[PDB]
mmCIF file of C-alpha atoms and ligand atoms in Angstrom:
data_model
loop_
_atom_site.group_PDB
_atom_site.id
_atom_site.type_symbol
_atom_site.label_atom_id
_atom_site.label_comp_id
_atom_site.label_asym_id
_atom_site.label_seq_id
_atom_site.Cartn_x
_atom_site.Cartn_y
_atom_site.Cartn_z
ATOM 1 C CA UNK A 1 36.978 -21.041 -100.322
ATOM 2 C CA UNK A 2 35.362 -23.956 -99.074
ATOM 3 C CA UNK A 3 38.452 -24.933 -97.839
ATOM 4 C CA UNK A 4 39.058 -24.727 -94.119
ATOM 5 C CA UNK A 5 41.483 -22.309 -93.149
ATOM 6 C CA UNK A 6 41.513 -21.375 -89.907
ATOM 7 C CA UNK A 7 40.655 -24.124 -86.791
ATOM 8 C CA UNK A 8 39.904 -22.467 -83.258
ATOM 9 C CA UNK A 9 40.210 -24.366 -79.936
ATOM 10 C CA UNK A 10 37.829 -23.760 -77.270
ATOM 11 C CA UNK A 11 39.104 -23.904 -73.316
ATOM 12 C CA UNK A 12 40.215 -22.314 -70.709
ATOM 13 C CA UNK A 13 44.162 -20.916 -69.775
ATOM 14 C CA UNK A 14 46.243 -22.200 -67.379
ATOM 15 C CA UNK A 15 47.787 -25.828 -66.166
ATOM 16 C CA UNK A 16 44.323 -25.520 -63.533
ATOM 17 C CA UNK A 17 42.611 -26.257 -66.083
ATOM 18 C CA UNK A 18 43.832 -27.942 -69.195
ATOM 19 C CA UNK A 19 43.031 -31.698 -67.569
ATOM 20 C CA UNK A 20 38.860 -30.639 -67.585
ATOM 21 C CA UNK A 21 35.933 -31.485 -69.679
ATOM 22 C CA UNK A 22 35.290 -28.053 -71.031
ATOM 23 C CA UNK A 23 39.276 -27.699 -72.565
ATOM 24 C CA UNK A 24 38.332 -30.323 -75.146
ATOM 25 C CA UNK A 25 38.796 -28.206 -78.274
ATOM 26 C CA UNK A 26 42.140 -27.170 -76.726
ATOM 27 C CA UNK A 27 42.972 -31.330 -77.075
ATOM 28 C CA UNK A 28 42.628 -31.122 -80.661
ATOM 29 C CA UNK A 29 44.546 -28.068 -81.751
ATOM 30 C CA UNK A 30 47.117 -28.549 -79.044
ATOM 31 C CA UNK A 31 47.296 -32.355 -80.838
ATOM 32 C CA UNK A 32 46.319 -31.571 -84.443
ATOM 33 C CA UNK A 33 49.254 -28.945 -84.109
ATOM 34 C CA UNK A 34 52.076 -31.864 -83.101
ATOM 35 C CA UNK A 35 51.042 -33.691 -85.555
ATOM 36 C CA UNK A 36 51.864 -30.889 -88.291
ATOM 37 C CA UNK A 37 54.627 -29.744 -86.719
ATOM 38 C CA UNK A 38 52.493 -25.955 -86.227
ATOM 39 C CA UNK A 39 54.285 -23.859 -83.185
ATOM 40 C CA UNK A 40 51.617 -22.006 -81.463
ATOM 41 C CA UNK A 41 52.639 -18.866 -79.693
ATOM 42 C CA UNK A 42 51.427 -15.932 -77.549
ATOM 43 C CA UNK A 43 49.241 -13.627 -79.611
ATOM 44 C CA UNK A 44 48.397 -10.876 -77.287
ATOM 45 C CA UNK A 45 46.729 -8.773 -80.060
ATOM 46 C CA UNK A 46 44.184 -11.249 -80.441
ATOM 47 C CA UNK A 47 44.217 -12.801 -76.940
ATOM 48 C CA UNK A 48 44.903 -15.722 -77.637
ATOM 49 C CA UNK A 49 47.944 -18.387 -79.120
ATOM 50 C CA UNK A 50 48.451 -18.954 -82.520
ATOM 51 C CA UNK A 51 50.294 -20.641 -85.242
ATOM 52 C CA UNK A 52 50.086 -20.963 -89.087
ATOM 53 C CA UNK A 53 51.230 -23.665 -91.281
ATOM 54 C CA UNK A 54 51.427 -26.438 -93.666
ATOM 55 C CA UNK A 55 48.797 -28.877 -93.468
ATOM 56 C CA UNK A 56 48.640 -31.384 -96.130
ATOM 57 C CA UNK A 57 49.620 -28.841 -98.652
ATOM 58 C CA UNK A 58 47.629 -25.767 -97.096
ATOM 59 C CA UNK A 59 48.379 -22.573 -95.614
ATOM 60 C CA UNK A 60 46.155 -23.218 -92.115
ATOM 61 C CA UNK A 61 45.801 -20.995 -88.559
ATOM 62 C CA UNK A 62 45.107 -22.330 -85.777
ATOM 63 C CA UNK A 63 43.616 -20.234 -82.500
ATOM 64 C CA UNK A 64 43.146 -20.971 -78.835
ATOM 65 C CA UNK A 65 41.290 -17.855 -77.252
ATOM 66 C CA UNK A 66 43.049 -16.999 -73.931
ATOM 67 C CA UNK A 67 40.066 -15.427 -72.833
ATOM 68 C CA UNK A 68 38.125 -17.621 -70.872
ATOM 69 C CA UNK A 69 35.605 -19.726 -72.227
ATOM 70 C CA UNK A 70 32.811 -17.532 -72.037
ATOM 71 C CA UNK A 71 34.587 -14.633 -73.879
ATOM 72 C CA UNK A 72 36.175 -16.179 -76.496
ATOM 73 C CA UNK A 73 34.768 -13.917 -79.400
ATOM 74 C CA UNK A 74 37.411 -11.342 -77.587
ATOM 75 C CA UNK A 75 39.844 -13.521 -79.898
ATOM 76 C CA UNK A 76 37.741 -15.092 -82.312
ATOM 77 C CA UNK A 77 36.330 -12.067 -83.936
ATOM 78 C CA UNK A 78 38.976 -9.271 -84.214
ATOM 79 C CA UNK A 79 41.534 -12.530 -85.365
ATOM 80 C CA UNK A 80 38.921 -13.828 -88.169
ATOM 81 C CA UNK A 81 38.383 -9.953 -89.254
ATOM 82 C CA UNK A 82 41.772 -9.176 -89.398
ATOM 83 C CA UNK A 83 42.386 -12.200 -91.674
ATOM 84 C CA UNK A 84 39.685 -11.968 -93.682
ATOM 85 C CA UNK A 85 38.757 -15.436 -92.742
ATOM 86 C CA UNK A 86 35.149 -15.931 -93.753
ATOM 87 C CA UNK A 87 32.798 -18.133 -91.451
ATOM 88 C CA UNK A 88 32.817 -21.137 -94.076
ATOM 89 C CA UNK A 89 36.269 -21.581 -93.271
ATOM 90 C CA UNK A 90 36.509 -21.682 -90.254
ATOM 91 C CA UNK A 91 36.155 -24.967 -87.474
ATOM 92 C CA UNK A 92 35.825 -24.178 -84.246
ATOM 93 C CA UNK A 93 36.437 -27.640 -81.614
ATOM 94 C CA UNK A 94 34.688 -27.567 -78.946
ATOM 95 C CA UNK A 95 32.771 -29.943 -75.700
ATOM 96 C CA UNK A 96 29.869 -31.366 -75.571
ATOM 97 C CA UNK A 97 27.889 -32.267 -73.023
ATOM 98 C CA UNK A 98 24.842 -33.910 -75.060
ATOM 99 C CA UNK A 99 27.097 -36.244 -76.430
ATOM 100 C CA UNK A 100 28.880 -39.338 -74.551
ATOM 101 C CA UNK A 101 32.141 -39.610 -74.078
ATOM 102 C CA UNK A 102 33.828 -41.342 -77.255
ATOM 103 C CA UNK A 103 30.956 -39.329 -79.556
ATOM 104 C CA UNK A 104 32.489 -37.164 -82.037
ATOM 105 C CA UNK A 105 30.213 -34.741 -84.718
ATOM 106 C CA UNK A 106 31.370 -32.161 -87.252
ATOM 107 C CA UNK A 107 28.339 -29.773 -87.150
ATOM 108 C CA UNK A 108 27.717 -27.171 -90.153
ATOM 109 C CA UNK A 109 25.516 -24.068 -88.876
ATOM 110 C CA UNK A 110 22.760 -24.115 -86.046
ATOM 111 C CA UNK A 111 23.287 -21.641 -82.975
ATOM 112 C CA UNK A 112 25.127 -22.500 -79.501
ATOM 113 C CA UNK A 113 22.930 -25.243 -78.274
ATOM 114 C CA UNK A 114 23.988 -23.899 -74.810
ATOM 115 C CA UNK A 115 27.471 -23.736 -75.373
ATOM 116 C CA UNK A 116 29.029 -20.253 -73.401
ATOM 117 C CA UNK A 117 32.111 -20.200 -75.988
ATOM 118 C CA UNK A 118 29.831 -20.312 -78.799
ATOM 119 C CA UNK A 119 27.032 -18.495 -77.532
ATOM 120 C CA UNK A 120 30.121 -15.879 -77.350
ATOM 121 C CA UNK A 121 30.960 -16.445 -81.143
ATOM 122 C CA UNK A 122 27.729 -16.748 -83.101
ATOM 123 C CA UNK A 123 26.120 -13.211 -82.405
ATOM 124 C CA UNK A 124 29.525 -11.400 -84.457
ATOM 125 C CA UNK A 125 30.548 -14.182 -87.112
ATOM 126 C CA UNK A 126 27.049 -15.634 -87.720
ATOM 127 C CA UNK A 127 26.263 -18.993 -87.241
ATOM 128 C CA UNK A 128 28.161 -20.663 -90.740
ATOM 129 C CA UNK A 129 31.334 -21.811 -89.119
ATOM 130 C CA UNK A 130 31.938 -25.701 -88.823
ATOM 131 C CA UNK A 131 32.327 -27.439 -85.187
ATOM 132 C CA UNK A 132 33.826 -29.937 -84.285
ATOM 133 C CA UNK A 133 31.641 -31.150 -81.383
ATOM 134 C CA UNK A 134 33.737 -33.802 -79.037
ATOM 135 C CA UNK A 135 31.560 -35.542 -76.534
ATOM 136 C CA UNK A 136 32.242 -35.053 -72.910
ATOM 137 C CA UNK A 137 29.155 -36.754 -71.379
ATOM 138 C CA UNK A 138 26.209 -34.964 -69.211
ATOM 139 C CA UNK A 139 26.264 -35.467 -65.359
ATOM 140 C CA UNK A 140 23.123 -36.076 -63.667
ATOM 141 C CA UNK A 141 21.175 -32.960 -63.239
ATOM 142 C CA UNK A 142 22.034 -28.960 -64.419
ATOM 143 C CA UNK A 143 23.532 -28.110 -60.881
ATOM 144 C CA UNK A 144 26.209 -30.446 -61.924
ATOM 145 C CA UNK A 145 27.237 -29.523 -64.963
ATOM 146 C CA UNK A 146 29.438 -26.531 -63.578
ATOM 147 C CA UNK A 147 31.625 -30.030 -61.479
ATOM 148 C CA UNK A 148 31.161 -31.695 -64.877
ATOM 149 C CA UNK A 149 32.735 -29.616 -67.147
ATOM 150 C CA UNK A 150 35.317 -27.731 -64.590
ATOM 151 C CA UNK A 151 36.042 -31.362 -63.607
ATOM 152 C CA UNK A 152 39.208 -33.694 -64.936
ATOM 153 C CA UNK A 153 37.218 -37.379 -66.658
ATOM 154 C CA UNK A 154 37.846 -40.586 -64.624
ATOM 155 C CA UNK A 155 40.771 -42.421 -67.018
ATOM 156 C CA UNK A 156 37.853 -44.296 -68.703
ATOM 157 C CA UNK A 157 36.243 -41.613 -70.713
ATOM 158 C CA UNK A 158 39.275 -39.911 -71.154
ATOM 159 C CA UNK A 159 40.060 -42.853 -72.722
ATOM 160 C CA UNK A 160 37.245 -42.338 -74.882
ATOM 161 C CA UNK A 161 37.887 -39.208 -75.664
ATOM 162 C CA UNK A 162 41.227 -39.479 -76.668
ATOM 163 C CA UNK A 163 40.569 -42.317 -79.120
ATOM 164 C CA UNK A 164 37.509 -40.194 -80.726
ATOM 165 C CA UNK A 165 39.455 -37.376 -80.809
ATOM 166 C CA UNK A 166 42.417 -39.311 -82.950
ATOM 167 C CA UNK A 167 39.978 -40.185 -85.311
ATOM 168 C CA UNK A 168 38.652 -36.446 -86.420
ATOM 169 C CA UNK A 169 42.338 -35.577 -86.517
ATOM 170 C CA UNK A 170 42.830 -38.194 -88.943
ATOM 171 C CA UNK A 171 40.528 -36.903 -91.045
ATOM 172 C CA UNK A 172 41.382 -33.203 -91.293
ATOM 173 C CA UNK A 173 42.809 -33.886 -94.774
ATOM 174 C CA UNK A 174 39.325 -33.705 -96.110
ATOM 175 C CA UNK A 175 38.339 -30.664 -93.953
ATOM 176 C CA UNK A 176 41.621 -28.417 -94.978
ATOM 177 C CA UNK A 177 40.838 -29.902 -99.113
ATOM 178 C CA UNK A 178 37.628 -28.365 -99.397
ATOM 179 C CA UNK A 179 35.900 -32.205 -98.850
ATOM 180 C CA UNK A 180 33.645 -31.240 -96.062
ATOM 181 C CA UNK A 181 30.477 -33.661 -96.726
ATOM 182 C CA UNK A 182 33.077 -36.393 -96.690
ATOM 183 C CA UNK A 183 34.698 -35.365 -93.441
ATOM 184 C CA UNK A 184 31.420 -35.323 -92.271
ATOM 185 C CA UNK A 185 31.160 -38.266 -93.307
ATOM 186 C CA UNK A 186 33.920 -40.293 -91.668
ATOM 187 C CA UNK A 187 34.139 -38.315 -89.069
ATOM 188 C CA UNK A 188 30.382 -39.114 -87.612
ATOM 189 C CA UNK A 189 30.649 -42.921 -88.066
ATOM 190 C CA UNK A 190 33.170 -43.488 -85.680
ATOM 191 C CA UNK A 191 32.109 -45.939 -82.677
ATOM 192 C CA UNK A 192 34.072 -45.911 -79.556
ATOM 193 C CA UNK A 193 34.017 -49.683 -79.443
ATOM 194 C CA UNK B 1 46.030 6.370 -43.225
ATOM 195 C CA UNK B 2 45.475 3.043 -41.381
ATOM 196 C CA UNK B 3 41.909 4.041 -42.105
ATOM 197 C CA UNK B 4 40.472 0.673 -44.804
ATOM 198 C CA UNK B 5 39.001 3.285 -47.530
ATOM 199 C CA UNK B 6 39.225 0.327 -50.186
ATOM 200 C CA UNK B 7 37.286 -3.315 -49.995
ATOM 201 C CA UNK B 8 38.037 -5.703 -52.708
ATOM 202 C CA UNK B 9 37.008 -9.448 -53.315
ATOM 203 C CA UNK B 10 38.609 -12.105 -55.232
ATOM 204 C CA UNK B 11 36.584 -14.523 -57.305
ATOM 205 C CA UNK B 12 35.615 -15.691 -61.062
ATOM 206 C CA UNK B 13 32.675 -13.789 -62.645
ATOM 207 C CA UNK B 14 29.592 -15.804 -64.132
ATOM 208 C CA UNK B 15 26.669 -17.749 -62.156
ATOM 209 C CA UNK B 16 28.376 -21.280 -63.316
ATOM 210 C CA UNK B 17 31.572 -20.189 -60.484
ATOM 211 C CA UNK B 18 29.364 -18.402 -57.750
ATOM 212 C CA UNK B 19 28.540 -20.760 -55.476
ATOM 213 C CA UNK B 20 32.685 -21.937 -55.876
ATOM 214 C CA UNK B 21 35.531 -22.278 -52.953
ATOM 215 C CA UNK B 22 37.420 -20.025 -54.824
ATOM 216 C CA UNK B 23 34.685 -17.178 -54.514
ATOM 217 C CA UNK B 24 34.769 -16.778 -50.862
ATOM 218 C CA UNK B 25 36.506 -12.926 -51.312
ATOM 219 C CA UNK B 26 33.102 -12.123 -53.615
ATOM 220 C CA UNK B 27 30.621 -14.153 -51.068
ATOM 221 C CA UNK B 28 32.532 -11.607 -47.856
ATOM 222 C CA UNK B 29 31.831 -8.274 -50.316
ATOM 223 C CA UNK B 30 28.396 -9.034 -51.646
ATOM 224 C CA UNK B 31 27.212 -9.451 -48.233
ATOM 225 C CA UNK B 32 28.970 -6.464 -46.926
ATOM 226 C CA UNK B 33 27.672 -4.279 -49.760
ATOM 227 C CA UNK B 34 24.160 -5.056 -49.082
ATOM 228 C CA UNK B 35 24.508 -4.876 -45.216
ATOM 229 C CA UNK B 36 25.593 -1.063 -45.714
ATOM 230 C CA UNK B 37 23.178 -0.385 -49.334
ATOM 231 C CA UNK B 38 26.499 0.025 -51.670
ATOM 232 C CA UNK B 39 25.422 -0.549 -55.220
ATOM 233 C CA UNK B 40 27.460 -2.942 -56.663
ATOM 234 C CA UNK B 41 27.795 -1.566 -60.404
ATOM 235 C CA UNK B 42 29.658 -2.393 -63.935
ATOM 236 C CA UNK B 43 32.117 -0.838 -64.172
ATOM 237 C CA UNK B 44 34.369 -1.967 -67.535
ATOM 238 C CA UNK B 45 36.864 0.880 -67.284
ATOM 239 C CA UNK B 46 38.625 -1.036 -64.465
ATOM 240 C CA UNK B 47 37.466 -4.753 -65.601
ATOM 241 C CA UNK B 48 35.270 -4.895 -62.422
ATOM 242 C CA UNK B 49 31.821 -4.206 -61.058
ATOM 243 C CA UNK B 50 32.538 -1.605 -58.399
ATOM 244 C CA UNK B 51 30.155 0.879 -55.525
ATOM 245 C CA UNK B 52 30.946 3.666 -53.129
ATOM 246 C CA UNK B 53 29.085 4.302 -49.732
ATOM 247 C CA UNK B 54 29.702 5.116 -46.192
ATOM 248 C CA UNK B 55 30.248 2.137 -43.954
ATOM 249 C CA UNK B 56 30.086 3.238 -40.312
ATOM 250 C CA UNK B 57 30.815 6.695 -40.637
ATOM 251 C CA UNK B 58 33.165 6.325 -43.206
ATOM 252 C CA UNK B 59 33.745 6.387 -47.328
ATOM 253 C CA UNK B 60 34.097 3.451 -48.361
ATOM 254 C CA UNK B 61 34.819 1.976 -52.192
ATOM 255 C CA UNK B 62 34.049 -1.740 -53.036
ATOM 256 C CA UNK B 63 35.623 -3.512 -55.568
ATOM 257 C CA UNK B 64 35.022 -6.948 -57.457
ATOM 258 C CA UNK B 65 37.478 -7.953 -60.398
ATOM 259 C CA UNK B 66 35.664 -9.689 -63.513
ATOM 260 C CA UNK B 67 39.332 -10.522 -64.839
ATOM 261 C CA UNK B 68 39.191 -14.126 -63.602
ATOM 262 C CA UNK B 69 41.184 -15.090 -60.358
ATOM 263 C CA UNK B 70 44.381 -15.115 -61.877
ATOM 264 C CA UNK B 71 44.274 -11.656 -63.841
ATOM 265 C CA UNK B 72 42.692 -9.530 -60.801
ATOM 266 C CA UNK B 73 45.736 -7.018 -60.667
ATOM 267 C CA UNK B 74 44.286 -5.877 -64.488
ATOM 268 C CA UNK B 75 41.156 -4.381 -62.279
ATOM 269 C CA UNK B 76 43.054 -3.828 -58.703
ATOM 270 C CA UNK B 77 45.980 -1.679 -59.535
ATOM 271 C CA UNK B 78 44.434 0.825 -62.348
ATOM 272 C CA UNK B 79 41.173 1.169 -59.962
ATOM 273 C CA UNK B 80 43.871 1.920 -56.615
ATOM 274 C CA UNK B 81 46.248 4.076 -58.755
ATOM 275 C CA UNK B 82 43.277 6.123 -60.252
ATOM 276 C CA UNK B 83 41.598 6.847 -56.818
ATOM 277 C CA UNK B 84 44.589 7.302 -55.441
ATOM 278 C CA UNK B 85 44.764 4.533 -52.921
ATOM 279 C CA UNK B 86 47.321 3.963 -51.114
ATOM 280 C CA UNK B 87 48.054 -0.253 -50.537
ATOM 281 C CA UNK B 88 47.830 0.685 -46.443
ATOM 282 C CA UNK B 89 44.432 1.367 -47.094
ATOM 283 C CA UNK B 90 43.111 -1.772 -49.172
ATOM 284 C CA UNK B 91 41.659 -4.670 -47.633
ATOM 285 C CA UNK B 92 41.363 -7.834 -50.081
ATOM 286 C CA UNK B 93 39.146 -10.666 -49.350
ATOM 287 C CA UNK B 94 39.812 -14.329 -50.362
ATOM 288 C CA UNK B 95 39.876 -17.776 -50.027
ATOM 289 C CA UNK B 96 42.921 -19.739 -48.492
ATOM 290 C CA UNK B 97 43.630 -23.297 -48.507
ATOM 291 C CA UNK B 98 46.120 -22.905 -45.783
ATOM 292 C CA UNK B 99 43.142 -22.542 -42.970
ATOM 293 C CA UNK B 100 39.981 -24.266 -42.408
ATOM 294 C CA UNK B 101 36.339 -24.147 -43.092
ATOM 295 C CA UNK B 102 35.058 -22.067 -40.173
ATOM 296 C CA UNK B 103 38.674 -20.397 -39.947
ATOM 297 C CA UNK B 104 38.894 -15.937 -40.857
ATOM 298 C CA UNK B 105 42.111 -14.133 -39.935
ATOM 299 C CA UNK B 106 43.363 -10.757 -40.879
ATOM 300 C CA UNK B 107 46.994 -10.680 -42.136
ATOM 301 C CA UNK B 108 48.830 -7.675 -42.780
ATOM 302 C CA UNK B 109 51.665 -7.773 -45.346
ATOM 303 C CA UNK B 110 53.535 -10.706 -46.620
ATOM 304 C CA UNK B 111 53.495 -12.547 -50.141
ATOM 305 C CA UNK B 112 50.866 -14.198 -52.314
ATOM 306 C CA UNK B 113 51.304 -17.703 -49.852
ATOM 307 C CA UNK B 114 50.380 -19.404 -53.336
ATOM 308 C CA UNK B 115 47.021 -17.563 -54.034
ATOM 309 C CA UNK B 116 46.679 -16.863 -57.854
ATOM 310 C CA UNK B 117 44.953 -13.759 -57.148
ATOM 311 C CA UNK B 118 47.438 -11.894 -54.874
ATOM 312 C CA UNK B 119 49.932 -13.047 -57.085
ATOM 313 C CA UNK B 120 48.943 -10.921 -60.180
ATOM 314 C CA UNK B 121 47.983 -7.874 -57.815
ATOM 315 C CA UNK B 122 51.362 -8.200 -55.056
ATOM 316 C CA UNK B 123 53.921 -7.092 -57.920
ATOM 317 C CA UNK B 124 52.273 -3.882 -58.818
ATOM 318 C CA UNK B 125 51.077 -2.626 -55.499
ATOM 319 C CA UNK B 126 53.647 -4.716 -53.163
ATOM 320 C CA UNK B 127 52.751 -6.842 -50.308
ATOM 321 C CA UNK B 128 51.838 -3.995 -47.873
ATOM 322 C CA UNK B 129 48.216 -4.627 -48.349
ATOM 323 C CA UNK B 130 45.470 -6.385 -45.653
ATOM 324 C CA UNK B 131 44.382 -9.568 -46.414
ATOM 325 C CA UNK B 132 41.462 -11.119 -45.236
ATOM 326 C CA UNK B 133 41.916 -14.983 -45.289
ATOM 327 C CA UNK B 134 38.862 -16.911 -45.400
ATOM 328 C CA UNK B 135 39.131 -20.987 -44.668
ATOM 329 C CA UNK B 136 38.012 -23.025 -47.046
ATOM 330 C CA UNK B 137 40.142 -26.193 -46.069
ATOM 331 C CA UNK B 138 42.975 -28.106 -47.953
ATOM 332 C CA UNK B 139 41.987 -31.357 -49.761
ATOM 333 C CA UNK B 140 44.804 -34.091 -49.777
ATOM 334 C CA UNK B 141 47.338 -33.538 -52.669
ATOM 335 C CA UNK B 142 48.028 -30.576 -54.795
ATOM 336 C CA UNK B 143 46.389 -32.098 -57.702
ATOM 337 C CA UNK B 144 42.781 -32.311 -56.067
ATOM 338 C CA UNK B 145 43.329 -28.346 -55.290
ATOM 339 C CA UNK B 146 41.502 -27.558 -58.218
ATOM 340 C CA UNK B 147 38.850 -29.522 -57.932
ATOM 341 C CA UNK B 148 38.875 -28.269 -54.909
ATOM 342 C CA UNK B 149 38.831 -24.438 -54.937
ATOM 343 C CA UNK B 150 36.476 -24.349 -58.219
ATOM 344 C CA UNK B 151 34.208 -26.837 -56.579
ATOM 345 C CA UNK B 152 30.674 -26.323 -54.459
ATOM 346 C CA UNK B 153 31.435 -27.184 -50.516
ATOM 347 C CA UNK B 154 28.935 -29.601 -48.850
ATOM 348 C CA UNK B 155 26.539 -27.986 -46.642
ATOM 349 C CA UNK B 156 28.602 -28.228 -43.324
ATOM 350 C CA UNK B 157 31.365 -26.514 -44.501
ATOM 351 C CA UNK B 158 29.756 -23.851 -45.908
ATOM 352 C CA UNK B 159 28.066 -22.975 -42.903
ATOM 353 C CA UNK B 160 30.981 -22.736 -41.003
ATOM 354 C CA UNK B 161 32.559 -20.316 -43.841
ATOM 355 C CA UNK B 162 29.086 -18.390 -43.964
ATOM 356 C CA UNK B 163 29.684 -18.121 -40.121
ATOM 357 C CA UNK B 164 33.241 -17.053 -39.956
ATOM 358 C CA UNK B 165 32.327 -14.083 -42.689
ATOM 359 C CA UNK B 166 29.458 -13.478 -40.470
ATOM 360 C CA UNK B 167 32.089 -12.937 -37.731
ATOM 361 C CA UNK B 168 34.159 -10.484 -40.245
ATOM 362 C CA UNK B 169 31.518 -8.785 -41.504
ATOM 363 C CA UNK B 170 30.498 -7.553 -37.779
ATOM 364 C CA UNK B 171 34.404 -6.037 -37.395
ATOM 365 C CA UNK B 172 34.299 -4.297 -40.380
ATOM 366 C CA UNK B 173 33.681 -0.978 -38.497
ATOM 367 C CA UNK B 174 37.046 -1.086 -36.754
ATOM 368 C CA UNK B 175 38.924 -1.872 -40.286
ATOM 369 C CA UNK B 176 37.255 1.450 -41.824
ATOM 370 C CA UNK B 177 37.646 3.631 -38.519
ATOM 371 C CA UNK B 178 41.385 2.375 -38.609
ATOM 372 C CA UNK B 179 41.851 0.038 -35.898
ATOM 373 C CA UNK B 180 43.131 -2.708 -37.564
ATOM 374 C CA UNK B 181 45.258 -4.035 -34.771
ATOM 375 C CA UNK B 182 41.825 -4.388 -32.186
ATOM 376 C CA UNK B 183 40.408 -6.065 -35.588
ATOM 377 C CA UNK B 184 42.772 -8.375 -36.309
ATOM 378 C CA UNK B 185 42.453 -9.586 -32.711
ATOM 379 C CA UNK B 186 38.800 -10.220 -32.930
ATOM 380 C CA UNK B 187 38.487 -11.391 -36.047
ATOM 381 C CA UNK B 188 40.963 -13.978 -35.510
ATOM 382 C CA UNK B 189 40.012 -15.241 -32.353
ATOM 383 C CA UNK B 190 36.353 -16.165 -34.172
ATOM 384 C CA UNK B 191 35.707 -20.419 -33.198
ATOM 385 C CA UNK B 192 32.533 -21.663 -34.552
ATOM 386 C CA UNK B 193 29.923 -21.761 -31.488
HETATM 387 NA NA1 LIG C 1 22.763 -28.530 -76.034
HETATM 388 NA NA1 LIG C 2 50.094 -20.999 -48.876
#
């Protein structure tokens, strides 16, 4: 449909973790579902929370996998089959560590780059699903980036974060329209400062 | 049967939480299954990677949830109620924040004390279970905890965890022959040298 139609979350469950890096995507479903006024509930046939609703004029679901990160297909999949959701309409929001804190990207295609929720994903949807790729900063060396991404961000870049992640949800008009070169767009040219 | 016929140790699966606090339970198995030769094997019937093998004269399972901490009862109580184990007879491994680096005790009975494992396993089995508590230390407030328990200890500590499970893993053969009273006295004695 062009049109997006359903937006996943990527994170991990429980208060433990919904402060760290790697719940980013959870931020902006969690948020973009205030905003709209979407209730998302326990879904234990797709292991996960959901929520449908209006917004801007279209029907939209929203997903956070209660999986784990690394097995979030366990929802992903079986929920976008069930729906008949095609990969084209779907955005999936997610961490990322290549990216600085206060960098946002909307992404069409590629594989996981890394990424253990995607790398979950890609193999049984294909890789033509949108991202929403929220920058989370890299720490020093590999054997950090467990610490890194496990870890709650120093106020700062949080700050950052937060402030990117404001602006994509401001533009999800375009995505849920159909307009996805233009949300691409807007979204990409926003500068932290 | 005060005889230990069932070993299980709490952790997270995956590389990225191995070297974790919270994976002391899996550290105390691991090394106990390849002091005796157990094969450690998947086994996704029962969630968990799981072996069988005489320890010391005895038959002895071993069992490692891949649930995630706080979902280990989804791999604990189907694999005790299919073998027919009876909670007297299951020793579970873990970390506690209540005791220090270098710290081991055995505790028979009691509640979860806060652990997020034993909490989804203590409902469906009860509390009449052995516990083997292994220190990892308590940082200052409850909101560096998890930072904490999913974080890498510094060198120093971890030797004087990898020397306390040392300690526990040398009085397994009284917890399997059934003497758990003469066990919990030597194991909880253990002081670092
Ligand atoms: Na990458
Ligand atoms: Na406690």
């Amino acid at each position: 449909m062009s049109n997006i139609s359903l937006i996943v979350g990527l994170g991990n469950p429980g208060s433990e973790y919904a402060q760290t890096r790697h719940n980013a995507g959870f931020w902006f479903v969690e948020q973009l579902a205030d905003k709209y006024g979407i209730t998302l509930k326990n879904d234990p046939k797709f292991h996960g929370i959901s929520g449908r609703g209006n917004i801007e004029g279209h029907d939209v679901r929203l997903l956070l996998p209660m999986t784990y990160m690394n097995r979030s297909g366990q929802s992903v999949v079986p929920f976008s089959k069930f729906y008949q959701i095609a990969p084209e309409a779907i955005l999936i929001a997610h961490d990322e560590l290549d990216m600085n804190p206060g960098v946002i990207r909307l992404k069409t295609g590629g594989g996981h780059g890394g990424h253990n929720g995607l790398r979950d994903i890609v193999p049984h949807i294909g890789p033509n699903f949108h991202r929403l790729r929220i920058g989370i900063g890299h720490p020093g060396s590999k054997e950090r980036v467990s610490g890194h991404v496990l870890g709650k961000a120093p106020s700062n870049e949080q700050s950052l974060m937060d402030g990117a992640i404001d602006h994509a949800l401001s533009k999800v008009k375009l995505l849920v329209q159909g307009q996805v070169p233009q949300a691409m767009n807007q979204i990409n040219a926003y500068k932290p400062a």
